[PDB]
Amino acid sequence: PMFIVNTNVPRASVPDGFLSELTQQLAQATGKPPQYIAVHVVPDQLMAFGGSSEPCALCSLHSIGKIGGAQNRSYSKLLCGLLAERLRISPDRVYINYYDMNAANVGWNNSTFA
Amino acid sequence: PMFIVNTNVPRASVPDGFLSELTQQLAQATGKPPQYIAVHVVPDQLMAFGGSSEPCALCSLHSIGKIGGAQNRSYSKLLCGLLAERLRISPDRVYINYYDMNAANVGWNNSTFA
Amino acid sequence: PMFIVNTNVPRASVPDGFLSELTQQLAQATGKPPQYIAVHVVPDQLMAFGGSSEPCALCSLHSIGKIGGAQNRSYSKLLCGLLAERLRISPDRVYINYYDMNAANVGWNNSTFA
Ligand SMILES: Cn1ccc2ccc(-c3cn(-c4ccc(O)cc4)nn3)nc2c1=O
Numbered sequence: 225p226m227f228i229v230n231t232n233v234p235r236a237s238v239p240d241g242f243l244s245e246l247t248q249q250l251a252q253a254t255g256k257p258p259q260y261i262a263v264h265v266v267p268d269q270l271m272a273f274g275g276s277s278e279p280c281a282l283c284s285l286h287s288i289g290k291i292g293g294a295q296n297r298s299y300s301k302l303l304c305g306l307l308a309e310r311l312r313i314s315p316d317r318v319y320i321n322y323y324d325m326n327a328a329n330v331g332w333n334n335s336t337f338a
Numbered sequence: 339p340m341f342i343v344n345t346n347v348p349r350a351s352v353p354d355g356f357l358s359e360l361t362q363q364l365a366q367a368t369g370k371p372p373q374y375i376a377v378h379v380v381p382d383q384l385m386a387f388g389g390s391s392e393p394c395a396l397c398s399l400h401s402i403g404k405i406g407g408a409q410n411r412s413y414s415k416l417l418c419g420l421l422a423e424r425l426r427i428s429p430d431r432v433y434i435n436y437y438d439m440n441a442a443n444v445g446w447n448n449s450t451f452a
Numbered sequence: 453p454m455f456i457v458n459t460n461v462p463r464a465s466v467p468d469g470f471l472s473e474l475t476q477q478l479a480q481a482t483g484k485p486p487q488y489i490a491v492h493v494v495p496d497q498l499m500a501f502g503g504s505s506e507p508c509a510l511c512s513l514h515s516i517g518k519i520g521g522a523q524n525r526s527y528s529k530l531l532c533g534l535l536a537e538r539l540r541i542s543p544d545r546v547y548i549n550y551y552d553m554n555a556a557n558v559g560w561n562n563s564t565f566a
């Protein structure tokens with residue numbers, strides 16, 4: 225899986241351990257190997273949510289499977305919880321785009337998964 | 339909705355009120371409530387379009403509905419117009435990916451929109 | 453087409469010619485005209501792959517057509533090869549999301565491609 229979070233929170237306010245925590249928590253939530261979860265945090269961004277520049281986050285999660293109605297609700301609670309606790313971003317100011325990728329449409333290690 | 343624009347134009351060229359203008363203009367164009375529109379502008383990027391590094395922009399608009407043939411043409415006219423007038427980017431050096439997202443695939447406020 | 457590569461490799465380690473090389477190699481592999489290929493490289497990112505901070509990359513390729521099983525395998529070999537040779541990123545630390553975009557969902561030049 226691939227998880228990206230873009231935010232206007234400053235870099236200094238991203239705690240040590242955050243990328244590793246996202247990796248472990250996503251492995252637990254998706255069942256996917258932590259070795260093959262990629263995480264990316266982009267602080268200091270020029271962004272607004274509802275016209276306001278208070279802390280916010282725009283995110284994505286891509287996976288081959290493990291994406292669906294009930295799972296995505298669970299991931300949203302998990303990820304909003306982490307962003308609130310670690311980055312002090314309110315959950316009402318977080319968006320996450322989920323993508324159920326076809327195995328043929330993900331490149332990795334010189335090939336795909338199909 | 340979520341609107342992102344990445345560009346090689348420098349930060350100092352982005353007008354102070356650009357995020358607010360995008361929010362208001364997208365609410366009018368999509369009919370979506372302004373308090374749910376998120377906007378993100380990323381200047382100073384290392385990019386090329388046709389192998390040239392003249393001003394360009396790569397963008398995305400995600401929305402649950404309000405995406406379609408005629409609507410997307412209208413959004414492109416609006417958004418290319420703003421990028422041309424505000425950032426001095428030629429419309430023929432702008433790409434916008436439109437995504438009609440399922441509500442179950444958009445996380446927000448500890449859940450999804452489904 | 454649109455190709456984006458986000459990486460933790462530092463900016464100074466991106467060679468002169470990298471964007472031009474990507475543009476030309478993508479035109480050859482896809483058959484798409486190079487004047488319409490956009491490329492974007494984002495170095496110095498805070499990202500991890502498998503919890504590790506060794507060089508890695510998270511990428512996307514969007515195209516109207518030219519996306520499919522065998523084609524995407526070919527693009528992955530090409531792009532991992534370039535990232536390995538030019539940015540010193542191991543292929544097993546590269547993910548690429550492929551998107552076959554409907555022409556009506558690609559904005560350009562004040563309109564769309566359909
Ligand atoms: C059992 N096993 C073993 C190795 C593995 C290795 C990789 C994956 C895997 C990777 N993605 C993914 C990553 C980035 C994207 O942008 C989209 C999808 N989805 N699944 N899954 C497995 C897996 O399920």
Ligand SMILES: Cn1ccc2ccc(-c3cn(-c4ccc(O)cc4)nn3)nc2c1=O
Pocket residue numbers: 319320321339340370371374400401402403439444
């Ligand atoms: C009538 N009504 C009322 C409330 C509302 C509230 C929210 C939305 C809404 C949110 N998205 C969206 C945001 C971020 C994404 O990354 C993708 C999609 N699309 N629509 N729509 C409505 C809406 O249409």
Ligand SMILES: Cn1ccc2ccc(-c3cn(-c4ccc(O)cc4)nn3)nc2c1=O
Pocket residue numbers: 433434435453454484485488514515516517553558
């Ligand atoms: C034959 N011919 C001629 C002109 C042309 C002109 C443009 C394209 C074209 C552009 N995209 C694209 C760009 C950015 C995106 O974000 C998504 C898709 N895909 N194809 N294709 C052609 C093409 O195939």
